[PDB]
Structure formats: C-alpha cells, structure tokens
Write an enzyme that holds these catalytic residues in place. Structure first.
Site, PDB file in Angstrom:
ATOM      1  N   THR A 133       0.766  -1.087   0.025  1.00 25.83           N
ATOM      2  CA  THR A 133      -0.080  -0.084   0.098  1.00 25.83           C
ATOM      3  C   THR A 133       0.844   0.989  -0.050  1.00 25.83           C
ATOM      4  O   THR A 133       1.551   1.498   1.046  1.00 25.83           O
ATOM      5  CB  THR A 133      -0.847  -0.097   1.296  1.00 25.83           C
ATOM      6  OG1 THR A 133      -1.508  -1.436   1.472  1.00 25.83           O
ATOM      7  CG2 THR A 133      -1.982   1.012   1.256  1.00 25.83           C
ATOM      8  N   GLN A 134       1.316   1.636  -1.160  1.00 24.06           N
ATOM      9  CA  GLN A 134       2.184   2.905  -1.280  1.00 24.06           C
ATOM     10  C   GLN A 134       2.049   3.770  -2.309  1.00 24.06           C
ATOM     11  O   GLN A 134       0.782   3.842  -2.986  1.00 24.06           O
ATOM     12  CB  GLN A 134       3.744   2.348  -1.385  1.00 24.06           C
ATOM     13  CG  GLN A 134       3.784   1.044  -2.212  1.00 24.06           C
ATOM     14  CD  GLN A 134       5.404   0.675  -2.495  1.00 24.06           C
ATOM     15  OE1 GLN A 134       5.680  -0.091  -2.018  1.00 24.06           O
ATOM     16  NE2 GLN A 134       6.228   1.704  -2.952  1.00 24.06           N
TER      17      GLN A 134
END
Lengths: 233, 233
Positions: free
Chosen positions: B1-2
């Site tokens: 999740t970036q």
C-alpha cells in the site's frame, strides 16, 4: 569405549570419528546393488532390486526427480523418499522461479548440505541411504554419488550397495571404453548391465530383478522396469 | 500500500535481426520537479542482459541490489559462472516477474514497469515486460508508460510483426529508437533530453551508450506562431 561415543551424531570419538554417521554408511552396505555410469551424451543407472520372499515385489531403487534428473537408492528406502522429494522440490523451484533447469552439480551441493544438518545436531539421526544421481544439464551428462556423511562426488561411473566393489572395478577398467559410447544409448546401458553383473552371486539378473534408468541429450529421464529390460540380460 | 515518489518515465525497446536495443532517459522526477538529472535506469546484468526500469526510483534501486545479488549468488560453487551456467535473460526475467507478482499479492508492490532485453545463449533475442501487478508480455517492440503511447506506434512501423525482425538492421533499429526518444522529449512533460541506450547483439555483444542527447530538433516553425486564434502580431 563405544556405547560412550556412539549414542548421538553430535558426539565425536577420541579419534575424530562420528559413529552414528559411520553406522549410517553401513545400512547402505547391506542394501542391494546399483550402478551409475555415463558417456558424454547419456547417463544410466542400473540397479538390482531385492525382494523379501518369492511372493513379493522387488522394491524400486530409481526415482525420477525432474525430466532431466533422477537417482538410484541403496539402504533405507524411506530416507531416499525424503531426499528425492527434497530434490524434486529444489528442481521445481528452479523451473518455477528462474525458468532454469537445476544443475546436477547444484543438486549435489544441496543434498550434501541437507545431510550435514543431520550430523551436527542432537536428537536427529543421519540419513541411512546412498544415492547415485545422474542428469543431463547445460554442461552435459553427469553422475554423482551421495553418501549420508554429506560427501557428494561427481564421477564417470560407480556403484554402491553389497558387493559394489565388483562393478566398481569393471567400470574402473572399462572407463576408456564407455566414456566414448556417444550417440548409442543401448550400448551404455549394456555397459552398465555388464558392470552390475560383476557384483552378483546369489542369482542371475532377471526381468523382475533389473531396473535401468537413462537420461541424456534427447532423452528425458526415463525408467525401464521389467518387461522392457529383457533385451539387456 | 504505497505511492511513488521519485520516478522515472519511459523505457523503450525493440528487437532487430541480431539483437535488441533498449533506451531510457536519465531523469528522476519528484512530481513535476525534474529533480535528478543523472539517473541511470538501464541496468546491465552480466554481458547479455539489460533491464530497463521506469516507476519509483527507490524501488528501482532495490531491484538493482537484487540483480547484483543474483550475480554474486550464481557464481557460488559454480565453476561455469562465466560460461555455460551464466545468467540468461530468461532467468533474470522470470526471477523479477516472480518478485513483482509476489509483492503485488502482498499488497505492497514495487511500483515499477520493467523491460528485460537480452540475448539468450543460443542467439535468440529476448524482450519481455513485467510491471507492478505481475503482468507480463512480449512483443517485437515494448515500451512503458508514456512511450507505450508514442514510441510503440513509431517502432511498430519498422517491425510490425515477427517476420519483420529478420529484415531489420541495428542501424535502422537504433535510428528508430533515437527518433522515438526525440518525440518523447517533445511531448512527455516528464522527459529529459539526456538518455542512455543499450544494444545487445549476438555477435558484437553488449554495447552500452551513455550520455546521449536528443539532437536534430525542429523548433524553428515556432517563430511564425502568434496568439491563439486572431492575434496578428
């Protein structure tokens, strides 16, 4: 003396020996015979299978690990299952992750390391089975001899099991000959059969007795049992 | 999740009769700020592969470290590391494609689009793409990001199908690549004028050209453009 230094593999004797490992090497010496020999194009495994009674089957000695690698066993069969299963996995990892066929030299290195772990820690026990690994990779044909002590050696031919020393001499002599049987599979096998037949004593190799495996250039590891070895007696 | 921070734009490539060519500019953008002008996004692996990477730069730097490790680890107990058992483009690709898909499946992707260009040991050209989602594909031309929109149409006029590969020379291919790179400097707001190009040929090997600059640009016509419709002066 002994029952003092031979209870665990974790114990070195006063002379620097590991008795459990040596006792492991013995179970191999009572197993049936198997031969491995290679030319520059094929590698074959010939193994004499052994029964329990004349009413039973002849326990398999050869196991296919991938389309380009396999091995013959001598000693504790379950252990061979444990180790050949590891080989199958490692071979598989190489194909899935790198799309690369595992090198026999690499397979040997991995087997050594797995066996070693079982010789330096308490509670465990060394593996009690020997293996002859043949395979055809990017560098040609190969034959490797694995011993439970962890020592893996690459050879032109060899043999393990009871009376192994017989076939080990025929090959040691026939070297200059078989190392040149290129492009002729049946010959190599025959050479192997001749080699194995020098360690016999009990009976003559029969259709229920023999087991041959061959791998090479345009030959995926294939196992010939019973019916199809008739042409080699 | 970036979310990507420092980024690299297009990586373009195409295969020709005896090899492949790949190019990528030398910029590392931070949003709309063309922050770093000396970033090399083409990574040679040995003497037969170049991995071009677009996307997040911290992640590219991670992939670089991984590639250098693959080379170190393949030399281990490998007498044939600089020969028969050297890393092939197909091995490097499959490895990366494996990592990319695993990272996406853990919901922590390496925010990149990668093209692995190279030549296999038997002479075959290798060109394959893999991105942050583990998606992979091969084509006579491959380009990432913006280049997929503007470079592919151009490179495809040279090699529209498989049969066109054997009719294309390095001279022609390099000319097309160089022109695409110019078009991209024209229309991609995140491009740099400075780029790198690499050719992997089955005879001449790896030729890696650094510090190239888009030249022969047409801007003169701008003198005659005034206003946005009715302005006459």
């Amino acid at each position: 003396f002994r029952n003092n230094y031979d209870g665990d593999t974790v114990t070195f004797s006063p002379t620097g020996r590991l008795f459990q490992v040596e006792y492991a090497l013995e179970a191999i010496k009572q197993g049936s015979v198997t031969v491995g020999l290679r030319s520059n194009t094929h590698a074959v495994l010939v193994a004499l299978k052994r029964n329990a009674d004349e009413l039973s089957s002849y326990q398999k000695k050869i196991i296919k690990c991938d389309e380009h690698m396999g091995l013959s066993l001598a000693g504790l069969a379950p252990d061979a299952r444990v180790l050949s299963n590891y080989l199958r996995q490692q071979c598989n990892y190489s194909s899935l992750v790198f799309n690369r066929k595992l090198a026999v030299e690499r397979a040997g290195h991995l087997l050594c390391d797995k066996a070693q772990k079982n010789t330096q820690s308490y509670g465990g026990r060394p593996y009690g089975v020997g293996l002859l690994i043949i395979g055809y990779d990017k560098s040609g044909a190969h034959l490797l001899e694995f011993q439970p002590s962890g020592n893996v050696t690459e050879l032109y031919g060899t043999a393990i099991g009871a009376r192994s020393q017989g076939a080990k001499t025929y090959l040691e002599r026939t070297l200059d000959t078989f190392i040149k049987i290129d492009g002729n599979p049946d010959e190599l096998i025959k050479a192997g059969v001749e080699a194995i037949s020098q360690s016999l004593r009990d009976e003559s190799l029969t259709v229920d007795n023999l087991s041959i495996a061959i791998v090479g250039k345009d030959t995926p590891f294939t196992i010939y049992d019973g019916e199809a070895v008739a042409k080699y007696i | 999740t970036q979310q990507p921070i420092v980024t690299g734009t297009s990586v373009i490539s195409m295969k020709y009769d005896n090899g492949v060519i790949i190019a990528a500019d030398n910029l590392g953008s931070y949003g709309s700020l063309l922050r770093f002008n000396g970033v090399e996004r083409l990574i040679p692996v040995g003497d037969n592969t170049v991995v071009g990477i677009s996307g997040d730069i911290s992640d590219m730097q991670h992939i670089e470290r991984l590639l250098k490790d693959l080379v170190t680890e393949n030399a281990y107990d490998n007498p044939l590391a600089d020969a028969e058992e050297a890393l092939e483009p197909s091995y490097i690709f499959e490895y990366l494609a494996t990592v990319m898909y695993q990272r996406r499946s853990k919901m922590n992707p390496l925010w990149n689009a990668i093209i692995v260009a190279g030549v296999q040991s038997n002479g075959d050209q290798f060109l394959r793409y893999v991105n942050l989602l583990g998606v992979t594909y091969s084509s006579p031309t491959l380009a990432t990001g913006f280049g997929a929109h503007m470079a592919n149409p151009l490179l495809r006029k040279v090699v529209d199908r498989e049969s066109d590969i054997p009719k294309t020379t390095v001279q022609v291919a390099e000319e097309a690549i160089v022109n695409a790179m110019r078009v991209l400097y024209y229309r991609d707001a995140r491009s740099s004028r400075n780029f790198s190009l690499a050719i992997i040929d089955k005879n001449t090997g790896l030729t890696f050209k650094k510090n190239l600059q888009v030249e022969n640009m047409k801007w003169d016509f701008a003198k005659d453009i005034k206003g946005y419709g009715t302005q006459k002066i």
